[PDB]
Amino acid sequence: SMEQVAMELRLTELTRLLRSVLDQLQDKDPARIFAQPVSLKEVPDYLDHIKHPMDFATMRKRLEAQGYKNLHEFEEDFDLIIDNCMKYNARDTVFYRAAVRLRDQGGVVLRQARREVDSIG
């Protein structure tokens, strides 16, 4: 149907926008602390601790299969990356501190993206 196509034009535009957002957010992690999932080989207990792991590459796989239906869903995943990190790691670590910085730097990007999504539908 033509109604179905039009939903698909909008999903595809959402995806284009969210790719820009994701790159912008990944630049706030120059150390690439959040680029890949935590290794179970290198942290075998990780799933005893964190129930929903998340990382930029897993967000990117989802994004390219147009699996984000809106910005809330994408914002939940981004917040997982930060929130998992601040639980697992202690306050005085390079990992926690990188989360805080990503959160603060990310919140700006996400403040304007929420306006660009509302603004352009």
Side-chain angles (χ1 to χ4, degrees), residues 1-2 4-6 8 11-15 17-40 42-60 62-68 70-110 112-119 121:
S1 84
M2 192 62 222
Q4 282 297 324
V5 160
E8 293 164 3
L11 174 58
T12 289
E13 280 312 302
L14 173 62
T15 298
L17 197 145
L18 295 177
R19 191 173 304 120
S20 171
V21 176
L22 181 65
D23 289 2
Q24 285 181 73
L25 293 171
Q26 201 153 8
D27 301 337
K28 310 314 177 131
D29 178 28
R32 300 188 75 83
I33 289 162
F34 308 112
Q36 296 302 316
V38 167
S39 188
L40 300 171
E42 296 153 349
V43 186
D45 76 334
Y46 187 67
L47 303 180
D48 298 337
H49 291 267
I50 295 300
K51 294 299 150 172
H52 299 108
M54 189 44 59
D55 65 88
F56 286 131
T58 302
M59 290 191 72
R60 208 172 282 284
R62 189 166 161 186
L63 182 64
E64 293 320 300
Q66 302 191 339
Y68 294 113
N70 57 54
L71 177 61
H72 187 72
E73 293 192 332
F74 182 97
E75 283 182 282
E76 283 184 340
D77 275 0
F78 176 67
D79 286 334
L80 268 172
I81 290 169
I82 296 307
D83 295 332
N84 292 334
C85 180
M86 298 171 72
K87 292 171 184 59
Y88 192 82
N89 303 100
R91 209 142 50 232
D92 73 328
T93 65
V94 62
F95 305 104
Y96 186 110
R97 281 157 186 280
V100 167
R101 294 167 65 76
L102 181 53
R103 183 190 65 182
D104 291 354
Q105 292 196 268
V108 172
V109 174
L110 297 176
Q112 203 48 41
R114 166 53 65 201
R115 306 188 62 85
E116 291 182 291
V117 158
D118 279 354
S119 183

